[PDB]
């Protein structure tokens, strides 16, 4: 089930730069049985390159392919706004048609620190029987960010869920919402609730905390 | 012009059975290799099934014994019969044409198959109140099923700075969503902010006013 491994998992490059994705196979496939496909969010895949060095009909001359044996390379000579999407390599030599796990090409903006806000549960929600504390990280880059929950300085893990927005169209920023859901009793048993953000854009981890009922 | 239009996907309980259809335009289904390939939510592509020009059918191990591929030449349609559905089958499916026995050269638009053992439930809307310069507020739309949900601010009058987070599936089987917005803090007391949530599968519309707190 010849194993294709793409590299890297996420490639951060700005428009105009030269993109170089790699696809390494566990077993050799003949050079004319590796295809490179493009996929945009919310869109179907798009055959870019067949035979690992030949271009599909319609594909600009900035996309290119090379390689042989087990190692193949997809080269975007000059990046465009429209090219930033996910890319896959597929081998179709043997019977098991396998794909790569994907390689995302996204616009690199300068490292931006998240604006961290915290939202305690409202009185209506507390009357409903459960409390969800929200932690909002606004307009940050890259997408990689660590959000920790501390209830009375005790690290709570396994009861919070994160949600990341799509990359913004203009400034290419991210927004993350971490919701910590806990019972009304467990909410009223403590006072200090803190969201600690560890991000590459923060020299020191930023702690946004509140006190229950104040 | 080769166009593949897919339909038939929708919500269904586990153990159910669906019949995905894909109508072709510009080429013959009987003379081409016709494949179904699905994309799991937040995951790469895996080839599901294929039907040869000579009537030979092949399936992946994950769909063997449960999925059946077929083609109808009088109406040039491709049918994928899904039986014994589980949450693993939740994905966006694509019908594709195979040129040169392995190259997926033309795709469809994709149809969504969502497999969940819940019941249709309306959302509960809670506020996320603010509290220098920029102030962040929002709405928490919790415990609804199924997707989607349209959220606006001030009946659409406010669009700049709105971040609507993707709905995550809680352990209870229902969805939770957060819609936040950054505004001038000075306008927090001298302007009315309402989040408008519309959930058509249950026909529930909730207009929630977000006013500041202590």
Numbering used by the authors:
A (entry chain L): 1 to 27, 27A, 28 to 213
B (entry chain H): 1 to 82, 82A, 82B, 82C, 83 to 100, 100A, 101 to 127, 133 to 215
Give sentences copied directly from the paper behind this entry.
IGHV3-53/3-66 antibodies carry germline-encoded features that are critical for RBD binding—an NY motif in CDR H1 and an SGGS motif in CDR H233,49,56.
The heavy-chain sequences of these two antibodies only differ by four amino acids in CDR H3, namely VH residues 96, 98, 99, and 100. Of note, COV107-23 uses IGHJ4, which is seldom observed among clonotype 1 antibodies but highly preferred in clonotype 2 antibodies, to encode the two amino acids at the C-terminus of its CDR H3. Both COV107-23 and COVD21-C8 bind strongly to the SARS-CoV-2 RBD, with dissociation constants (KD) of 1 nM and 4 nM, respectively. However, when their light chains are swapped, their binding affinity to the RBD is weakened substantially to KD > 1 μM. We further determined apo crystal structures of COV107-23 paired with its native light chain and with the light chain from COVD21-C8 to 2.0 Å and 3.3 Å, respectively. The conformations of CDR H3 indeed differ when paired with different light chains, as exemplified by the 3.3 Å displacement of VH G97 near the tip of CDR H3 and different side-chain orientations of VH T98. In addition, a type I′ β-turn is observed at the tip of CDR H3 in COV107-23 when paired with its native light chain but not with the light chain from COVD21-C8. One important finding in this study is that the CDR H3 sequence that supports IGHV3-53/3-66 antibodies binding to RBD is light chain-dependent.
